[PDB]
Symmetry: C2
Subunit: 393 residues, 2 copies
């Protein structure tokens, strides 16, 4: 549904209901609780002040009661993987096993890594537990922690990127876009008597915080829904603003000068190396799994050059036409490279983005399968471009 | 567009389409048209008339025959013609062009249009040019058409190797088996005939495929009649898949065609580059070149440009509909526009529009949807050299 897409990177993993010799994987953690109480506290603070001064409507009184309930239910759960998130990983693992049982048979060896963040470790474990229940004779190497920061949390390690993310030139563009797209008064009219008395700044922060609470609720497995606080057109506009925020701060927006994308090259390098070692026999893993974050997936996909995902759109109002974050990095977003060897020992690779075949701007006579030689050369050119970009910052 | 509209494939009507360039380079298919051939209508009519003569029609069959007889009257004399809708489609494309780029077509701007010899393409050109001239009568206009342009607009009739492939190439066994798998005629015939069993599978499938064809073209004719509800949405979906596959295999980048259907379009791509180079160099003073032709012109031209999606090579026939959609490439009035811009540094940019939406090429640009013309030209020249190499094998 359009409403689910307008949750953007908070969208739940979508519904997804001859044999490769290797699978190379990167997956975001599954659906999670909100990481921060900031938006909830802001909504609550506004409605409480209104209640003190007799300023709430009937529905604002009901919203306040509901916000108070969510505050209690979110307490001690911030950033945790939800039941839905566990179920999402079990589905991804389960389909992979169902689709390629030969690959995971007969004491096959798999390795999984995760970041130090608990929701990513727990996503790894839900995935691996499914793997093991299906074939307990798998050999399994499991590790996680800050030792993987350079390939899984590179967005925390590059000084120029951190500065850009915190105070770079994309910020004024985003804020002007929000002011253009989001009209706070009609939304607040639903909840507050005399909403025109609120300054535009506080009105905007209230509404954006409320959208944030509503957008994450379907990821929590809590049986409550707030999608009807906003019309479909209001969700559409909210999504356009958050989509633009993700694009400019994490992807290939001209304002970022490809800095957000270039920082991902160590992960693309490690992907190529693990595949080359398996192909050569230096490694005999049947799969490498990696569990991380939207901030890992988004630039990695752009650096691979998956078609659409690395477009450089110069007009901010055109971004949503050409680049759609809910297609790139929903909850549990994942990239899988599937390697095949044909009868003449040639190596083919299929790229799956959220379990659907993805296109690269190189030729192939057998789409969705690409020549690995051609693909690796292409990816190496992308890494070299990334290194050149970083040499200027 | 609704699903039922998309399932009309290349018979889908042009979709709804409700800083200054110095040149526009255009190719357009004719607008919505009448059926070119009475074969399908006659096959449907002869089966229904013959069953009626032996009292073999259901009530729904009788209603369908009454409708088929009206269509035969209304199609009479009109075969192949541009319809009123086809005219309004061209007026909309020209009108939106004029509104989007008014400075290009102001004062005494010079434009040239060509068309094939086929009347619906000539009439589409004239619908388009009348809009131009009515908006600005001070335009200078050069108008021409005919078989003299077959080499760039109907190259699909001129290449012996391609004509042989189109008529008796290796794609036909694939297409016929795909139709047999996808189309079950018996449920449809039970709707209209008492005892569909007395028909062989061969004639039953011919009847159903003809009825689909009659129903698919009707929205293009401006006749206030409609036959979509003769079929379920799933039946339309399967019919569209078979016709999409036929277009892909006989006209585009299917592996079974070995790029022969696409390579034949290189004279038209070369002529696009020539007319823009002559304007950039000053040899030519035109502000636009317009060209009116056919789906068989547009489909391989788009694939030879390498517009993303449109040149995919899919070996599994069942996967084609997932990755290649003929209603997105060549609906009625399908058109390609190249818009050329000169920035403050005298650099040439080009924007490629497919059916008035920005198209992507597999080359990089820091200002999508605008590409460097130098980079684009070099890429297009590489596409032409590939095409010539493909043709030397045939
Ligand atoms: O720890 P935080 O400072 O709160 O950062 C989180 C987190 O970023 P990191 O995990 O990389 O540190 C989320 O990324 P995920 O782990 O969920 O993949 C991101 O989620 P989105 O990518 O969907 O934006 C979220 O944003 P939000 O709080 O709006 O949900 C963002 O929090 P901040 O927006 O405050 O940076
Ligand atoms: O069914 P298709 O003819 O293949 O078109 C689909 C359809 O777009 P429209 O129905 O509006 O024409 C999708 O809508 P959904 O069914 O997924 O809801 C849309 O997805 P978005 O609206 O999210 O853009 C998607 O576009 P996309 O390329 O982003 O997948 C696009 O597919 P294509 O245009 O690529 O064929
Ligand atoms: O007149 P025909 O020799 O029978 O060919 C026509 C015609 O092809 P050409 O005009 O290029 O020769 C149509 O193309 P358009 O002029 O309409 O653009 C095409 O239409 P489609 O591309 O939509 O298939 C049509 O097919 P149909 O009769 O099923 O509508 C096709 O007839 P053929 O089946 O003989 O190719």
């Amino acid at each position: 549904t359009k409403i689910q897409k307008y949750a953007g990177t908070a969208m739940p993993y979508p519904n997804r209901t001859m044999t490769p010799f290797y699978i190379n994987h990167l997956g975001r953690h599954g659906a999670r609780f909100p990481t921060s109480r900031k938006a909830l506290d802001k909504v609550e603070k506004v409605l409480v002040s209104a209640q003190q001064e007799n300023g709430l409507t009937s529905e604002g009184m009901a919203l306040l009661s509901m916000i108070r309930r969510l505050s209690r239910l979110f307490d001690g759960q911030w950033g945790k993987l939800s039941k839905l998130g566990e179920t999402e990983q079990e589905g991804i693992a389960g389909r992979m096993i169902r689709n390629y049982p030969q690959l995971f048979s007969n004491s096959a060896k798999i390795e999984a890594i995760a970041t130090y963040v608990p929701r990513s470790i727990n996503s790894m474990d839900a995935f691996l537990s499914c793997m093991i229940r299906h074939n307990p004779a798998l050999q399994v190497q499991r590790s996680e922690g800050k030792q993987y920061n350079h390939i899984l949390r590179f967005f925390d390690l590059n000084k120029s990127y951190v500065n850009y993310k915190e105070k770079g030139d994309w910020l004024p563009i985003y804020k002007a876009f929000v002011h253009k797209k989001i009209s706070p008064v009609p939304i607040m009219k639903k909840f507050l008597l005399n909403p025109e008395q609120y300054l535009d700044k506080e009105a905007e922060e209230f509404v954006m915080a409320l959208f944030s609470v509503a957008a994450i609720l379907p990821d929590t497995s809590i049986p409550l829904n707030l999608e009807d606080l906003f019309t479909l057109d209001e969700w559409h506009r909210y999504w356009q603003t958050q989509n633009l925020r993700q694009y400019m701060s994490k992807s290939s927006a001209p304002v970022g000068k490809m800095l957000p994308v270039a920082i991902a090259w160590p992960l693309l390098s490690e992907f190529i190396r693990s595949a080359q070692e398996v192909i050569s026999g230096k490694s005999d893993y049947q799969a490498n799994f990696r569990f991380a974050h939207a901030n890992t997936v988004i630039p990695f996909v752009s650096l691979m050059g998956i078609e659409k995902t690395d477009v450089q759109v110069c007009r901010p109002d055109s971004v949503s036409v050409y680049w759609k974050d809910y297609e790139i990095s929903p909850m549990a977003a994942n990239v899988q490279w599937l390697f095949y060897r044909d009868r003449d020992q040639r190596i083919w690779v299929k790229i799956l983005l959220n379990e659907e075949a993805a296109a690269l701007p190189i030729s192939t006579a057998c789409f969705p399968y690409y020549s690995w030689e051609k693909t690796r050369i292409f990816f190496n050119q992308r890494i070299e471009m990334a290194k050149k970009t970083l040499s200027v910052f």
